[PDB]
Amino acid sequence: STLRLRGDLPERVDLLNITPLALSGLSETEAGKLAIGTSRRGLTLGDVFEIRLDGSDSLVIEGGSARLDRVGAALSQGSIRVEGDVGQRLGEGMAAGTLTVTGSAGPYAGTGATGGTITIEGDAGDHAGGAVYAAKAGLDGATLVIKGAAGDHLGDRMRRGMILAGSAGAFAASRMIAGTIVVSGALGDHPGYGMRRGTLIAGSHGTLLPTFVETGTPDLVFVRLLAQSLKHLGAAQANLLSGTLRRYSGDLATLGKGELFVPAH
Amino acid sequence: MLTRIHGGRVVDPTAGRDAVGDVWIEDGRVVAPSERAPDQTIDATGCVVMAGGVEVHSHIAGGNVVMSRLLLPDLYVSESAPNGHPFAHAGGSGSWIGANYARMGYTTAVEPALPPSNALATHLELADIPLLDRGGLAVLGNDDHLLQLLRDGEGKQAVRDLVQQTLAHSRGLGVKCINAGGASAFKDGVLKLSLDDEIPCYGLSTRKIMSALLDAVEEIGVPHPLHVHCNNLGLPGADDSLVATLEAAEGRRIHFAHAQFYAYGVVDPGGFRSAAERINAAMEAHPNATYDVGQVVFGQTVTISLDILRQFGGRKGAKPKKWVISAGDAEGGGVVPFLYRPRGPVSSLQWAIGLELMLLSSNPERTILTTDHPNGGVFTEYPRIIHLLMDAEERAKEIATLPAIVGERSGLPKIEREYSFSEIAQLTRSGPAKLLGLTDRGHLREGAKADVAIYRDDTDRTAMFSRAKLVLKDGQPIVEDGEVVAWFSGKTLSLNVEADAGMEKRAESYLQDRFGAGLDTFAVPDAAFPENTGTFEDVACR
Amino acid sequence: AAWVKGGAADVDAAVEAAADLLAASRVPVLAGLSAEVSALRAAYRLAETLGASLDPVSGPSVYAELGALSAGGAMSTTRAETIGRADVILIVGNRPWDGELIAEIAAAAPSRGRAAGAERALLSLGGPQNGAIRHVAYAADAGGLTISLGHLRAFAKGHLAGEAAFADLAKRLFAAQYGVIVYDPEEVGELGAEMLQGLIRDLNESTRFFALTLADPFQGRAAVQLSAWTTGQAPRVGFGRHQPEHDSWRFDSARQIAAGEADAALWLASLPAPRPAWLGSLPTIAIVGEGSQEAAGETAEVVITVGVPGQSVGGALWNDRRGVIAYAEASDPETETAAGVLTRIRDRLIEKGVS
Ligand SMILES: [Zn+2]
């Protein structure tokens, strides 16, 4: 199933429940009439894309804009590939499957994702992997891979899962409930503000919070397991765990059960 | 316009009517059967005909009700409403709660927590509720003004002047008190408070404040007695607190709010036993007493209460784990979300005690049905509770799924009596309106307001009462076959009383020194409302 | 007087011109929202019929507080009870020093509660070191107030060693009877407020502590109150799908205009509010007070002068001192009201839909 983007979007568009499982059930002509526009004038799937449909669990959106909200949200089966850039809330509440984006992504991408793998070959926006307004948690178990560089508040109020970023902005791992975030490169200022539990690993790091204290250079069994987990998934961040790392305890403002690992020297 | 509603089983327990007959209404009021042809005729095949439903205790407006929608935007589901009335299907909104009450046949709903400080915003919120007529119960017993009056012993006359001033300025229907002195004790570091315990800085009991408010209410002559929120809500041993508070009234007219949360026996000196039988026994020994139940509904909800002393006590039990406590001016308010586990040993007992208190009552007019919305549960579950009271075999169906503790610690499975329509009309219309003093609402006899609820007969009373075949507001049909057809604004009932001129100037100097603002900031002017002078309707004081 | 195109005075015709502009747009926006509750009520009622989004100018400050309390909750008090009961007051930032609130606390000791009549201790984090009012000032950390707030909570939790600057502060706070931490959510931020509100939760394990969340001066707090009971959700709500969709990010007027999503917008400013500077870029309808500088017809496509509440006409406004909605009568004032204009534009839009 391929959706060829006809042109530029005039308004924001909500691609929720536009999962290949749902499209397969609906008829090809009937699926075109499905309205996805936010505005009162609205927009239907036929107005936005050139719909070519087949009974498969694989979906490919050819062409993308930064006005594609909730793309891949609540995906429970199969795969969705976006050859282009996308908008906010990439795979909000994704149950399982795979979701790959060639371009960059909008803010709040990956919220509430339970299972599956969301891959952004480009760069992620602010609040990537973070909780939306009033949200109980951000990432809730699906593994999020950002080949590029994420913005501010990466993994904000993250509950479960794993984040694999190339580079990260300021206030990363803020309000983190639990999980693991491994950015291979740079990390912004004041990381892990309000961190309760979790594991943050970065190559570079900015100014640390006064509430983060260094434990030392401990050879832990968990590190060996996390390294082998990254090796098996083909992660570039797998090499970062090869050497000896420096540890910092989770922010003392909340219960200090979190941690931060940075290479020794 | 003359209207004839014939064929239906008319149920009016105040007149003794439980038989099929005609109901004639002219000019929005029930009239005697006119021998002339009516303009319109409404046929009810079966379709038991009752008066307009009256709700006595429901947190429908206030600054705390606003806070709950901010803290829990997920609580109430908003469905798509093509060609629907504005915000009627917008879950949680004032229009949503108004439209849903009308669908069940209710035409009057009373707010129990009207703060004298934020009276305008609470009444602006009440006014925006459509269709229903609404009311607000001014809350006293925790503001420095009244407590300084009691500390000095200014006399019953001086207290009456202050209770009159606040009732007039806040435009309230009656007087309420939520854990007397509990707020002015929580602010001074108190965590637990009983009806006799001395409260700091004023050296007085909570019964001292309650007895003083009981005098003022009888003196001024409010048709609705003192709406009382007892001490130690939800704590094992509150059956001992409610009973001692009832005996502290000394025979005066009172009304206990959401008494279900107080019928918790102490049992061993880790657990709690049902005290419904002990409370129902004291309620028959005191004829001047009345109470609304506050039945617990399984599922996610939120507890909105001005009892900041108890809401801070149970703050750590909130699910989801987030809470808003505000200690301001008088009582402020506390909002903690609570989930009643569907199989929970604590929740199942709370659900059983709610029914048990109603099943034990000799007179359902004194045992008014409420859910303490939303603290106990959402008001939309009234048709279910009516179905559970009327039908014994469906009550055993629900008891079958609940754990053994229900039978071992309550006795609800042993009491297998069914409730009748005349007794359900005492729960929902007759009793509540008689308590609130609204003589023209609880009944269908000639002289009543044309507030009529027609329910199409069904063995499944849940569906029977969820969607009413026809509901009338002052003679005009508002909902038909369970769907709202009309969309207009009602009127807020306020007790007509005059503020003492010598008391108004005395309070002005007090408010200017404590807040830095005059009475106009506490006032509730008609010009602020969408309907100038058309939003309020006077109620005479007996 | 009204203005349409080049200075069309007629008020009735300006309502028709505003109705035509909103009907032709697909993404409408209702910014500003600095007026009476009656006007806010009519603005939300118009957006429901229109299918528009709303955003008050106080947006950033409002959602800085709302963002922290919708997820973490709050432990708050009022201004009068802080002046009346609090024995130790912590002043975070520089914004609370603007009002007379800081002088009212210092001038007189508490008159109510357990700690009434006792010596009052005033501590300041991030405030000016030398002030006319005597207080104990604590230096803010290099990172900022938000970093300092997290730093301070660590000493209060007992996680950091003693003999530090914030260690003495933590010792002074726990030794309290009625504690109040005054802060402005705008300048502190969403993260700092959730931390600040958490520090209060840790402080309440020993003594009673509260927060005095500062109010915005552009009626934003009343808009929250009204929107909550009208729509069931906070402001920044959109009615494109007939139901109120809450999205603090999507329905942010500053975000929408910069991206180019909104075609038309309505500016509601009966009381003075900062000009948004985008009025000329897209077709706008400006409902503003007669006294304001925005009265001229150059500011927006359609400009309608209404009565300034509390000055020329009566209206229920947010009371800074009281902390609630109160009705303010006109101070020495037939003029048109913002509620009367928004209702007439809604009536004309409904009229166009029938035929
Ligand atoms: Zn209450």
Ligand SMILES: [Zn+2]
């Ligand atoms: Zn209550």
